[PDB]
Design a protein around this ligand. Structure first.
Ligand code: NA
Ligand code: NA
Lengths: 359, 359, 359, 359
């Protein structure tokens, strides 16, 4: 069976509340969907990013994927990476490749009649999640509500944003901690908001104020040296985490020497095929791995990562994916468990619902 | 004066022969063209890349640029970079920012009634070029005619491709040397075709076989340890050069520690605003700079770069620029001089040919 | 489907000729075979080493594998690795884990009715080999006969041994070059025979004498500083390779910074599940990968390794595998291609031959 | 338009009180003023230092600048630097070059009828300042009055001097914090007064004592190892800043690897042409930039510096510039805004006042 055709489409979905973090504001999410048909089946895969990702799939990647053996997604992946040298590998191009690869892996699993997790090397029956949102735009009550909600649903780890208005953050982390109590892990994400010495101040302060155990993207993160300084000088018990903007394997390799926990986003780092490589980087450096965003695809992919510590149950995406797809997984109890009776990703586009949000 | 409106369009032009290099084959070029309208004038900027670049400009950039002060392109650039964090800053996104930035600077120069070179900090009156082509697809005669042609025109530096069929390269470089004589500098580009020890072999072999002075992208430019190895071990008088694919200044900063000659492409590295930062990297590290591709923009932009060694007079681009614009400069005698009698880039779209090659 | 039973057996097969290399002499091969029974199917896997491996499988590993889910070999592997902390993880223990892991992957693939290469991520339809023998015990005729035979059989890469008697080696590499001609790659293996400066001498002498492309284990296995030194100072065109004694993923990570080509042996580095992590280490450091020994297993596993340069078609193992199993692959033409119709590894124990060689 | 002539004069202005810092005492300021005439316009530029700067301009620089294209200050700057290799590039030499470059930039902007900030690549509409003084010769009441006055004028950051009499500094920093209250940032400058371990003591001591967030030149800025030590070991939230004395860009490149915040003085670092390179250094290392001294020129020059954190509103210099010049900007509210209605730097010598302070 050969890959017959890719169909690309895009959707823009308003957030349920205006959102912000340390370095950005936004009020919608755009999903780019790839469907690959071949051998009488079809696979689906997606990324989040600009609408121009769809034009890039159609322009550079459709002619590479079409006609290919449907049973070997990594071979197409290799040809796709070679093809886009001039067109631009990182950013939009890498998001485009990740979407197609995920679709092609879903297509392969379905041609075999298997759940994707059983078409992949499998270390985990289920994977642990952390509930993630707590945007800097939320009033205290809504912050407390959202994180408390996840806690009571049996998710013992939650992440919130800091660093947009640093003077307001002490009260925000205290509020979060009071709502969830001592038994839940409290994680923060600065999204690149701090300078090095400011980051260093805040890592200490947040630890003292609310007993945080995780600090993500303290500094700009182009800033590898500042990451390494925070890794080396940060407080005990506060893991320094980064990696969402790493587009390639060599970048991931560099990053792994500067953090306590390495991150990658399956929708940016090259899809399933790319994410399959993070494991050797993380076992090699002996550090934990944490998946970033896109929970519905990550749940399958992360069953293959030995070094997984948790995946991110990111609010925007869990909501968009629940709205556009039938087949998403419920994080209740703190883990996602791929459904053994659904082949591939187990995800079906709800066509009329999505037509409503066409970009 | 304010930016009133951005117009984006794209053109695809067949190459005049099938073309290839060590790692890629192509038979056409796509230019994405931005026009910035404001204060009664119009600036233009462009990039070469995927048509999806135009959609990225429409979707993410036009809205930032519109309404902005027409006298301060860098203030817009900063707002553009901040705005695209989630949409993907490197690759397609960077190519888009670049095209828009060049258009905004063209516009500023025009509002001031100045050639672009005069609106920027100016170190150089004209700028030296090298003729660049010599694709691996060329039979020997056509390679000799292209290089000889440039030497006969008084351009004392030429670049060719190597590395696609390594067995054939010794006679291809010997043939090139015969065509140009002992007083034209012969430069090679491998476009990442070699492994580390392969590249070390060829740096020495090409020095002996044809007296080369320049070895570009011997290994993947993501491979900094490989580059550093070749910097340290390669023959005296062969400069190791790299740099087209970086999209952060810390990336350029990492590359500067690994090469003899740093390169950047004004249509990728963040436009004119991006290019202005390159001197600081190059003078800080004490290495020469060389501009990659897009001779028509680079002739102005490079007047502002103290550490300039030369700019690449790239065949594909020179040809597409003469075909699509009036006002392109002649490299006769080895340099490009901005026209003091034209404002901005001095470039005007030939709207007839434009339509012929509309994407 | 659960793993029901491991059965372990061992076979000693005399070499067809007395064999030696730079630091060892031997005249037989011992294979330790595991058979995993589950769900009405049987999987097989093996390693080469001391008979004690089989006792170690029985004593430490059977009790972990038995009762396990037969559809997720990596979950068992992680439990096996945890279990053997006091018993000794590297060496015999790793060889034991490698054998069990391969049998569990064979069992997994066969319960699905798929060829093993199609139950793994797959970048390659077939994989390139080099012919490997040329022992230091061979008279010149025999040496020329073996390497030339491989060359005529369509294998354009061959490896011989050096370093046992360095005064004799110049005539031996020359005789080898003379037999195969200029169009076959000639590779050598010192098996740890040299001191640092001796190795540097020979790397250059062998390059001048016979255009060798490849020098494996020039110094002792444990000597990383010496490898990195030969890597940094060795001649152009000669790849320095090592990795056959690497038992674990962090070791592989350390070695990757020291070599031109990284090697691992599927029967030592933790079987299929361990080999799957090698690709992220190689693409991370941007170096090629080369599989060492056991070509019957490696043909399937290496289809999943994007960074694969070649696999070693090692005389002793090709011979033993052909004697003991039905279903081995022919490297005629220079590559090994997993048979798309046979489930698992496609390997069947020949009971009566097995019986003749029982250890 | 050509540079017709350069005139040079000098002025000495006593301080309004006797002044000292950790390593110097002084009671006047000397400004060296350069005026450049061409195309019916007049540019003005200056530096602070020894009267002999004047003589150096006359002896080495006026003959280079005179006759030059008045639209290209950087080309003159490059020729000035080449010319003074034997006469001494750093110190006096650099201050002289700086003053001429500022004058020539003022001239270009004027010949274009633009405010200098508009004649430069421009990132910032206005620029934030900190009030800088707090000399170690001031009694507590004098100290509190100056800093408190800056605070009550809406300037939310102030710097004082420490280290001259270390015993006295706890009471002095406590007195300064009392005067400004808890919302004003308190910065300190040691002017190279401490040893390494002494500087380490005081960084912690001042943070506990008065909540300082900035520690400038704790050790000699020639001592990079000690700066790096204080950067690595200093308390979180206390930025380590240095850089007033570098004269070459690789010096700045070196210092950038040692501090939290990099500083340069536009009147020492090669003027406007030298400052335009600082962004490449700072962005390349992901650190902030802070301008030192000469607020009249910096209000303009720093508009071109994307990495700008703040400029120094240095007491002596704000006072001298007010005295000798028409057109100075007011810092009430915390920023300086170049006047859009006035071209070049907006400054004109008060001839009567100047005569009284003629050197
Ligand atoms: Na190139
Ligand atoms: Na100072």
């Amino acid at each position: 069976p050969r890959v017959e055709r890719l169909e690309v489409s895009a959707y823009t979905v308003p957030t349920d509340y205006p959102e912000s973090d340390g370095t950005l504001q936004w009020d919608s999410t755009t999903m780019i969907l790839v469907e690959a048909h071949g051998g009488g089946r079809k696979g689906l895969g997606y990324t989040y990013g600009d609408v121009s990702v769809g034009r890039f799939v159609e322009s550079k990647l459709a002619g590479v994927a079409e006609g290919s053996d449907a049973l070997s997604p990594p071979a197409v992946w290799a040809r796709m990476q070679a093809a886009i040298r001039n067109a631009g590998r990182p950013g939009v191009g890498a998001m485009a490749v990740s979407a197609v690869d995920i679709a092609l892996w879903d297509l392969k699993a379905r041609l075999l009649g298997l759940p994707l997790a059983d078409a992949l090397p499998r270390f985990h029956a289920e994977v642990p999640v952390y509930g993630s949102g707590g945007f800097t735009s939320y009033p205290l009550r809504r912050l407390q509500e959202q994180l408390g909600g996840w806690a009571a649903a049996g998710i013992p780890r939650v992440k919130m944003k800091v660093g947009r208005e640093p003077e307001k953050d002490p009260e925000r982390v205290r509020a979060a901690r009071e709502a969830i109590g001592e038994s839940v892990e409290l994680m923060v994400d600065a999204n690149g908001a701090y300078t090095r010495k400011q980051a260093l101040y805040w890592a200490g302060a947040f630890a003292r104020e609310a007993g945080i155990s995780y600090l993500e993207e303290p500094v700009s993160s182009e800033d590898r040296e500042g990451l390494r300084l925070l890794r080396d000088r940060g407080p005990g018990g506060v893991a320094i985490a980064a990696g969402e903007y790493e587009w390639t394997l060599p970048q991931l390799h560099d990053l792994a020497g500067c953090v306590d926990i390495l991150q990658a986003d399956v929708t940016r780092c090259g899809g399933i095929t790319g994410l399959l490589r993070v494991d050797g980087i993380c076992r090699g450096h002996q550090i934990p791995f944490s998946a970033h965003c896109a929970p519905a695809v990550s749940a399958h992919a992360c069953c293959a990562v030995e070094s997984l510590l948790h995946l991110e149950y990111f609010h925007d995406h869990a909501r968009v994916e629940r709205l556009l797809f039938d087949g998403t997984l419920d994080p209740e109890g703190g883990s996602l468990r791929p459904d053994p009776d659904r082949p591939g990703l187990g995800l079906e586009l709800k066509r009329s619902e999505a037509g409503k949000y066409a970009a």
